[PDB]
């Protein structure tokens, strides 16, 4: 498939909100980006599941 | 009967300065209620002017060439600070508060930095 669909989840509240695509071949390791979580109210690290 | 062969450092410098000044001007503008502060830097002095782009006329200006500034014993950085507070006072007398900077292409630092801090201290909002 080359481009699977992945979902990003918050670390404290555990809600899956954002979804994006990536290259598993290019980046075998997992992603870690900072987005905005609505209930938490502040930027928090996000780790894909 | 001597013909120079290569372009001169003076013109490399002048052309680069003009090009980068135009680069910044592409985004930086001015208006009547917010006159633009321009600075022209030299190896021996410093110049500052206030210009309204709508009419192409200046409101006030000052430079270190003046005798009172020249009389200061301190460094030419101190001269820059002196002219900075002088232009701050002149602009306040004119009746303008909000202004923007036209660095003129010269990289920020040193004299420009000191002038900016002196202005900010004098009580101009920007």
């Amino acid at each position: 498939d080359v481009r699977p669909k992945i979902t990003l989840a918050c670390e404290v509240c555990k809600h899956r909100n954002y979804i994006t695509k990536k290259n598993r071949r290019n980046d075998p390791d997992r992603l870690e980006i900072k987005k905005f979580c609505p209930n938490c109210g502040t930027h928090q690290p996000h780790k894909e599941s | 009967a001597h013909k120079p062969v290569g372009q001169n450092i003076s013109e490399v410098r002048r052309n680069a300065r003009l090009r980068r000044h135009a680069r910044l001007r592409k985004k930086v503008a001015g208006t009547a209620e917010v006159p633009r502060l321009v600075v022209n830097r030299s190896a021996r002095h410093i110049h500052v002017q206030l210009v309204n782009d709508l009419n192409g006329t200046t409101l006030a200006a000052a430079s270190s060439i003046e005798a009172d500034v020249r009389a200061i014993d301190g460094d030419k950085k101190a001269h820059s600070v002196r002219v900075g507070q002088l232009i701050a006072e002149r602009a306040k007398a004119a009746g303008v508060e909000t202004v923007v900077f036209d660095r003129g292409g010269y990289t920020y630092g040193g004299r420009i930095a000191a002038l900016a801090d002196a202005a900010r201290e004098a009580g101009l909002k920007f």
């Binding site: - | 001597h2 013909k3 120079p4 062969v5």
Partner: protein, 182 residues
């Protein structure tokens, strides 16, 4: 509280020698050295990139300033070269480093080359600049003969303010480059 001897020579005797010999208009039409460039063309980077490190080390030892690597702007198939690879290193100095390097060269390197017959005066380009190449690098004392793995040549270029060939030739000949006689 120091000054290179070559710089001394130049500013004391060479300047007025050339001035009186060529009858210049003012005291600053006399040409002066500008810069000097050192580089090599290997072409074996495509097959192995280890020798590049060795070249960098030799340049660092001989000059004392870490060189810079250069990439290729044109990918070519029949030479099996593509964009992005480094092939050679370039070094340029200024000022007292030129003075010291030229002193060391003129005083040590030139007399030491096996079968040294001089330098061809017709190596100029017509604008008053000099550049020539070497086939070996072990002549220099700073490099120990035991630690070299392969023989590597080099190319040397010097650029001055001479308007044309004549002024630069006179200046450098007064400096004392061992040319031929033709």
């Amino acid at each position: 509280k120091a000054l290179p001897r070559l710089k001394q020579r130049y500013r004391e005797e060479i300047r007025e020698a050339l001035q009186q010999e060529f009858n210049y208009a003012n005291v600053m039409q006399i040409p002066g050295v500008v810069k000097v460039v050192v580089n090599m063309g290997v072409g074996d980077a495509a097959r192995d990139a280890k020798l590049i490190n060795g070249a960098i080390n030799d340049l660092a030892l001989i000059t004392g300033q870490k060189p810079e690597v250069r990439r290729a702007r044109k990918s070519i198939a029949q030479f099996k070269l593509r964009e992005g690879m480094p092939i050679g290193a370039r070094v340029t100095l200024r000022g007292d480093r030129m003075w010291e390097f030229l002193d060391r060269l003129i005083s040590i390197a030139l007399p030491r080359i096996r079968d040294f017959r001089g330098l061809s005066p017709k190596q100029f380009d017509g604008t008053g600049n000099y550049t020539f190449g070497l086939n070996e690098q072990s002549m220099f004392h700073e490099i120990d003969v035991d630690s070299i793995d392969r023989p590597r040549g080099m190319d040397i270029t010097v650029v001055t303010t001479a308007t044309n060939d004549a002024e630069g030739r006179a200046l450098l000949r007064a400096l004392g480059f061992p040319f031929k006689e033709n």
